[PDB]
Amino acid sequence: VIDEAGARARLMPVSKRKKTVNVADIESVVARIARIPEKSVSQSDRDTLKNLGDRLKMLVFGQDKAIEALTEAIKMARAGLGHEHKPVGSFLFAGPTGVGKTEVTVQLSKALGIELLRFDMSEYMERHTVSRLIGAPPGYVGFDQGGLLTDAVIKHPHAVLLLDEIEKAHPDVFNILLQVMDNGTLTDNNGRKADFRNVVLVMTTNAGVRETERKSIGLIHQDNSTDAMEEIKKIFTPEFRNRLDNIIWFDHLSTDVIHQVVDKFIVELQVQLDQKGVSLEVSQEARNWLAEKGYDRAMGARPMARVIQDNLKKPLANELLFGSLVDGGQVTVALDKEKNELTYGF
Amino acid sequence: MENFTTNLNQLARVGGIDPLIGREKELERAIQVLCRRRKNNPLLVGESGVGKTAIAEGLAWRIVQGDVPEVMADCTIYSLDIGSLLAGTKYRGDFEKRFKALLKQLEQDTNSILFIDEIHTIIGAGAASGGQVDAANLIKPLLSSGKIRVIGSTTYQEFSNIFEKDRALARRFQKIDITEPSIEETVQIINGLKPKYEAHHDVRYTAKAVRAAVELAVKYINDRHLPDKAIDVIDEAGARARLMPVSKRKKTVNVADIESVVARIARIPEKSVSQSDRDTLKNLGDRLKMLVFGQDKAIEALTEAIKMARAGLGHEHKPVGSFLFAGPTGVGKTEVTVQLSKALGIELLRFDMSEYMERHTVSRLIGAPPGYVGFDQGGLLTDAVIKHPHAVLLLDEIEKAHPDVFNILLQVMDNGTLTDNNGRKADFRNVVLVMTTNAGVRETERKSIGLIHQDNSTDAMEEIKKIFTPEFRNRLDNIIWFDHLSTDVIHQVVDKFIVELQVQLDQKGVSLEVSQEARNWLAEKGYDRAMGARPMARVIQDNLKKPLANELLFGSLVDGGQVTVALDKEKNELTYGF
Amino acid sequence: MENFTTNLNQLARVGGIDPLIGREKELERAIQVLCRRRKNNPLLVGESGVGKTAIAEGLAWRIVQGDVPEVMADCTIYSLDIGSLLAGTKYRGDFEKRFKALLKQLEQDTNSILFIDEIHTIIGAGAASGGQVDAANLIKPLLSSGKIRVIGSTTYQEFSNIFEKDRALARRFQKIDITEPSIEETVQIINGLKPKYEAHHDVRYTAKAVRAAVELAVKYINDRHLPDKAID
Amino acid sequence: MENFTTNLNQLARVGGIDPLIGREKELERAIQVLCRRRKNNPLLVGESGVGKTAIAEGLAWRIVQGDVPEVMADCTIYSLDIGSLLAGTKYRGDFEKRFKALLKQLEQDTNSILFIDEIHTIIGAGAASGGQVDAANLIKPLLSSGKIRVIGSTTYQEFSNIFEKDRALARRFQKIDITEPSIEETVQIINGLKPKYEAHHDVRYTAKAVRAAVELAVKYINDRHLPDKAIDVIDEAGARARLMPVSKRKKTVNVADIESVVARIARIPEKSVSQSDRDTLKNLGDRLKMLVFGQDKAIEALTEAIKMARAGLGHEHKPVGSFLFAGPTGVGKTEVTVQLSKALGIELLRFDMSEYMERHTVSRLIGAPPGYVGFDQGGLLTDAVIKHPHAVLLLDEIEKAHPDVFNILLQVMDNGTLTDNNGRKADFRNVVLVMTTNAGVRETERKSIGLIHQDNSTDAMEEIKKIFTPEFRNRLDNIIWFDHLSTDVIHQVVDKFIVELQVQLDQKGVSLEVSQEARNWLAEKGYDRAMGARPMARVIQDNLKKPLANELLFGSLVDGGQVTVALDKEKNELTYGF
Numbered sequence A: 001v002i003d004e005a006g007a008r009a010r011l012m013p014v015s016k017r018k019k020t021v022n023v024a025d026i027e028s029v030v031a032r033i034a035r036i037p038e039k040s041v042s043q044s045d046r047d048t049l050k051n052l053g054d055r056l057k058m059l060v061f062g063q064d065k066a067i068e069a070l071t072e073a074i075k076m077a078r079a080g081l082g083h084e085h086k087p088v089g090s091f092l093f094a095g096p097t098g099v100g101k102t103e104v105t106v107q108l109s110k111a112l113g114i115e116l117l118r119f120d121m122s123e124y125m126e127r128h129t130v131s132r133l134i135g136a137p138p139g140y141v142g143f144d145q146g147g148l149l150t151d152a153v154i155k156h157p158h159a160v161l162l163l164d165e166i167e168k169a170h171p172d173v174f175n176i177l178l179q180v181m182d183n184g185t186l187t188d189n190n191g192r193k194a195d196f197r198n199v200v201l202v203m204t205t206n207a208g209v210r211e212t213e214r215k216s217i218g219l220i221h222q223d224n225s226t227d228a229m230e231e232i233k234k235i236f237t238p239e240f241r242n243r244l245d246n247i248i249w250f251d252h253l254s255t256d257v258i259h260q261v262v263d264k265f266i267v268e269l270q271v272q273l274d275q276k277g278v279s280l281e282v283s284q285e286a287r288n289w290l291a292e293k294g295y296d297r298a299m300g301a302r303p304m305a306r307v308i309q310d311n312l313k314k315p316l317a318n319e320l321l322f323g324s325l326v327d328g329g330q331v332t333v334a335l336d337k338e339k340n341e342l343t344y345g346f
Numbered sequence B, D: 001m002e003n004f005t006t007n008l009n010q011l012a013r014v015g016g017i018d019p020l021i022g023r024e025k026e027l028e029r030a031i032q033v034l035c036r037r038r039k040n041n042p043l044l045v046g047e048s049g050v051g052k053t054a055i056a057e058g059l060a061w062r063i064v065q066g067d068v069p070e071v072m073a074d075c076t077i078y079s080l081d082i083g084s085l086l087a088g089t090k091y092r093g094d095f096e097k098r099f100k101a102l103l104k105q106l107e108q109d110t111n112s113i114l115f116i117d118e119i120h121t122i123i124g125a126g127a128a129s130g131g132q133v134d135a136a137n138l139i140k141p142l143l144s145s146g147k148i149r150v151i152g153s154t155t156y157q158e159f160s161n162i163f164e165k166d167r168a169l170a171r172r173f174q175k176i177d178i179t180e181p182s183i184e185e186t187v188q189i190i191n192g193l194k195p196k197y198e199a200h201h202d203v204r205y206t207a208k209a210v211r212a213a214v215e216l217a218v219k220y221i222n223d224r225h226l227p228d229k230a231i232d233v234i235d236e237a238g239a240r241a242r243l244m245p246v247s248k249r250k251k252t253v254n255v256a257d258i259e260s261v262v263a264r265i266a267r268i269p270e271k272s273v274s275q276s277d278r279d280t281l282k283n284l285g286d287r288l289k290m291l292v293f294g295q296d297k298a299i300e301a302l303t304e305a306i307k308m309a310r311a312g313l314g315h316e317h318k319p320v321g322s323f324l325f326a327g328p329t330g331v332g333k334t335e336v337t338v339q340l341s342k343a344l345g346i347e348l349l350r351f352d353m354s355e356y357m358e359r360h361t362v363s364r365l366i367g368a369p370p371g372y373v374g375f376d377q378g379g380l381l382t383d384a385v386i387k388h389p390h391a392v393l394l395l396d397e398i399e400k401a402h403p404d405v406f407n408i409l410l411q412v413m414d415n416g417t418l419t420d421n422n423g424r425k426a427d428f429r430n431v432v433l434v435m436t437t438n439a440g441v442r443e444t445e446r447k448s449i450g451l452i453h454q455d456n457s458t459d460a461m462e463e464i465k466k467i468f469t470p471e472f473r474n475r476l477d478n479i480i481w482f483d484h485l486s487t488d489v490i491h492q493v494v495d496k497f498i499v500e501l502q503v504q505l506d507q508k509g510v511s512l513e514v515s516q517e518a519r520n521w522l523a524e525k526g527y528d529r530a531m532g533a534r535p536m537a538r539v540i541q542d543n544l545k546k547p548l549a550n551e552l553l554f555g556s557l558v559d560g561g562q563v564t565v566a567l568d569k570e571k572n573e574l575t576y577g578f
Numbered sequence C: 001m002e003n004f005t006t007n008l009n010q011l012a013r014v015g016g017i018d019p020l021i022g023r024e025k026e027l028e029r030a031i032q033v034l035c036r037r038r039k040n041n042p043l044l045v046g047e048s049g050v051g052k053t054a055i056a057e058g059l060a061w062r063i064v065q066g067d068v069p070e071v072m073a074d075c076t077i078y079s080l081d082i083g084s085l086l087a088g089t090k091y092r093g094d095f096e097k098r099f100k101a102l103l104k105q106l107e108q109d110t111n112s113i114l115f116i117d118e119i120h121t122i123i124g125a126g127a128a129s130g131g132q133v134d135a136a137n138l139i140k141p142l143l144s145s146g147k148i149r150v151i152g153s154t155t156y157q158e159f160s161n162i163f164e165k166d167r168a169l170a171r172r173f174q175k176i177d178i179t180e181p182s183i184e185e186t187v188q189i190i191n192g193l194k195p196k197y198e199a200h201h202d203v204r205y206t207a208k209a210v211r212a213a214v215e216l217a218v219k220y221i222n223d224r225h226l227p228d229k230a231i232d
Ligand SMILES: Nc1ncnc2c1ncn2[C@@H]1O[C@@H](COP(=O)(O)OP(=O)(O)OP(O)(O)=S)[C@H](O)[C@H]1O
Pocket: B018, B019, B020, B021, B022, B023, B047, B048, B049, B050, B051, B052, B053, B054, B055, B154, B155, B189, B193, B227, B228, B231, C140, C167, C168, C169, C171
């Protein structure tokens, strides 16, 4: 560190910035050697972080608390008040399907500009597949491959690590994460250590969903919101749970949210169309209609993509493929009142 | 060094090397390493095809062109040929001598840097025998003291497996990670390299062609670094155009040519869709309706998914489509899928789900983990998809597989990918996924008990809903429930089976005529709502084929003959003659 | 190269190589690759007995006959015998000397193309013992410069077991898929080649005999592909 | 090329080669292959003693005789003389020049054929290290062009490792399967050469002697194929008579001389070629009684069943027989099996079913494709019955076997064979299966409930019926009961042990008298109706040895001396010093 700080300082004179080497240069050099960010927190990155919480709200509607939990873990670590030897944070997202549990994670990695390391836990449903994360013991056939998890975390030390559908892994695989979540390290089959102190660990689950949606028998419907109290507790051993920062429950999407979701999907459609030289306008009435037609509390936002696929994309595909709406036109969608059917045009 | 190394400044001065574009911070750090008092030996480590070599040689180019700091000015970078260093060193002492002589000449230059590509290769430098002194251990002391400066180059895999073990050597080098460039950076790299391709291939490229090459490769080519990925598209497009003016079809390269080149790998062009392929798609619904009678809903679901995807109104990363076909037996559930693959001209990948009846059988689809027997055997699903990226994937009996296997599909249906036991990814974006089932059928065949026979007919869906978990079930494009076939359908079914027989007989030189009455008779004789269409094949084997088999096999009806069948209304039997 | 490589153009002139029947698409792609400025090294990947070798030979034949674009004019495609190249060494400098001499005699040309069958043999360092310095590590720097054009040949299974592991050698070759001809195509292949069977055997085959050989082989012979078994 | 290869037409022209006897289609197949335009090099695959060389010689013989197709047409098969190519020089310089000159002359010669005998031996270094290590590399391209037709020579196991090693040869040579001649063919080859053997040894062989050499060798030579061993028997009988003062008078070699000769190697037929094809066995009921005292009917039943099998009552695919031996331990069930195997002149193969109790061990025994022993164990059972085809197979305590063992045995009982993981098959047509089990008497060891205890004796045969399945029972030749021992038998057993003790004491020099009461007592005390005489080993091991061993070792006792042990009234060994 001293020799490099010197060599570096010696070139500051190319712009004639002759100087004494001080702590600030030492910190910059260590940070560069270890690939750990540190001084820029004082710069434009203050705004990158300051506005993170809001940029994500233009992508995921509702679920404000999930955004806050992620946002704060990051700010503390950047501020400097992090922990001494733990991942940036360890979260277990849970809730009904189609509500942004995996989407918010993806968008976070994009918002921050860092790699997303994504693993599917459904592929590790057997006990002996834990070896794919670590590597074979010496003397075995797959010995020269290395582990896939320890390997990914070494090439990309600052990253968001996403483990999807964690409840589907064989439960013994969860044991690997005890040392990761608590000590920041994992050792591969050659004795190398992966260092997780700079990554964000997000696990997502559907535990408890089938049960929470069940109807009770009796005159009074019961409140089945306490799935956390049974399924999460029964699946994850106490020592696992006691190492988490937060278990965050995603909600069902209410109507207001759905209206925002529909607007979001329409914009995505408009982009695909612009690339083909045509454009699409939609009446507000038509949107209110699509939103109401597609709305189903039981499946979150998932089905909204289908109401759009049948009411807007399909008609257009025929107009695009068979010559009606090709180069030279535009399409306007409006709703009548008589059948509540949609218009199209050129 | 006279016959071992190349003075790279020599290439820089004569245009022997392509220019280095960008990489300011990479070069910034490399210089700071070279400027250190001790162990001033940068090592470039990264993924293949990202410019590691390009940067190391790029520095010689910059020195020659005056694009370096005075510190570097007048330095010489030499590139070493290891094979030529060992060649011919028979007898102890020749290898040790050549190597020492080389180092001495470098030590006495004092203003030169030695560059070694595939630096991992010097790790077990030639070994005479039991003695382990090898190009490497001896070639140490100098790196430590600062007497010499070298630049290393290796991939992440070789680095970790090769030297990533010799600590004494590894500690003498400073590792610099060379990352893959961004899209904007890649475009700029192509723009500066472009004139070399323009000259080599006698071509010109439009601005749009260059942007298309970079972005299309990113979207469609999966196994390579993006820069090496964009360059490759441009060079192939160049070469494609170079081979046009052989018949003097001189032209420049535009987006349409880039698209054709990328499509060669992606397997679905975005342009042919506007040509005659418009009719291929236009008529798809009818080509299939002529083969599958009734069940228009299935035809439409499949047909529309394809058209949207070809139109460009796709799902970004999800499969072309994902459908569950459910219903009574003998109604064309697997039949329509097979015919779709034929109508489209693409491979049908078939997997029989009844063979994956236990939880652990999943390793058969994706591969055994490292260290276990069969590790290097493969993984059937990921290989089939990797080998044939544009295809129809059919999973028969989606309910006979052990339920845990459905969890593999969740990942595929939603993200378009599956990872094998070597970390490679199968890409399903150009796959049509069809799963078939008869799970809800038995439940609607159930008889009620009581004075007021209550209706059912909702049970088909309730049974399906309790089989597939909601996260699976809502991830499908649709569920198509198939019906039983009516007698109108049977009349059409009999006609297609007779035609198949006529073809089968034409091949033996015998034609066959059947009257309308004979057909109506078979249709009524064979129809059974309960078993769908399949049984009609049996009524035909006994009424038409068996009689013919004996006439054809033992000589009364031979090639050049004709045979005729009609119904004898008095007997309610078929006639035969020839 | 005197006892390592064969000039296939010379063989095509003498007799040598049979003409290709129906492989124009494979040839169009091989030319498209060789005509590139970098990584212009096609690799033919197939199954045994599908014309996988025949195609590379076929290109040399077509060059000799003037059935190629002038771009390929005067090119020579000599086949390399790895066995004779590696046999007869056992000293420290032998593999590095013999190989370099071979390369120099190809490097000196501008129109020389080297054809290496069993390409995957070279992978894994080939005949290399004691720590890297594999033929691969002599070759990579040349493929990168475009100094020597190499036509490879292997099978799908060997292709995935050796290549795409040593990734630097995977991105330096252009893969071409060589499929197995259909029954009708197999018949066309037999009939084009037929005069030499009749000449060797002093026999004449009927049209029915030829078609039957292909159809019968499909129905009853199940350990290989048609260009080998129907002919057999 | 007079010193590079042997002209085999010329060798056949000067005696050398006898006409081939048998394997005419092998000669024709080689011709059919030689006549091909590509991949036209025949390979003779055999082993020593089955005609692999004789066939190559036969091809040359046919050529010198003109017994060839005009499609040949005036060829000249030469045998590569690896010895002569190397001899006189021992260096690559001349071996290479001679070898290449050989090939050039052979390539140039019209229709020359090069036979390489023992082609699997030049795979290493040509004739020897220092010669043409690349001989194969020179041959590959000439075979590919068809310049020299080459006839190969390998063995059955050598082929799979020599030709399959390199496709440049595997795809050139055609495989011809060469197997041994039959009994009458072996006689024909002896008769073909008989005049030479008679001339060579100044002997005459009878027709019976020649047949006996063949007919008896197959029962005694075991491992090498018959064609040579029957000949070695003829040559040894001749040579022996010529050397010994026999042929000078007794020129004739009769069957008795053949029996003496086979016995010289096997040590069997001179005493046991065939004493009583029916009587040695009937005398076994009584011979067994000399060692096994009791179970008289069991041994008679076995004898009757064996006699019946020998009568030819059964089927050509079936085992000699199968028996279940039921009863208490310690009643000689194993003793009978051992004495039968000795008397019948066969090996005993043994397996303990309690070690085949679990599913995994079951596959190891069977040699199932997965889960077998080693790489070709296989198949512990298949191996045992391949090495010793006429053996008796003893399976102990069969009720403890895993059900999969039980079923493999039933499958063998039905078809006479067991297939190895390597596709090899065991032949059980000549073996006897003896199965044991100590279950039929365990029920009678129980004490009943009640104020009055009752007799819990049962029908052991019914217990066997409950334990075993009827499919199993219906395939047995019998179920034989081996009962408990009488007082005089346990005396015979105790005396056998006492005598061995005395033999050991005699070796030291001490005489031990055991009173009759002590002999009776030890027999009664050791014997336990449930375990029979099994425990007798310990009643003597400790009581008649420990007290004596100690005196000799302490030093009170010397090498000589007379000691008596009498049983006293308290049943206490009344020993004395000496
Ligand atoms: N910034 C750049 N400017 C110009 N060319 C670039 C730049 N970056 C990458 N390249 C291209 O990268 C070259 C291939 O370079 P490398 O990736 O360095 O080769 P490599 O390191 O040897 O790859 P291996 O052997 O497979 S690990 C292409 O020829 C260059 O055009």
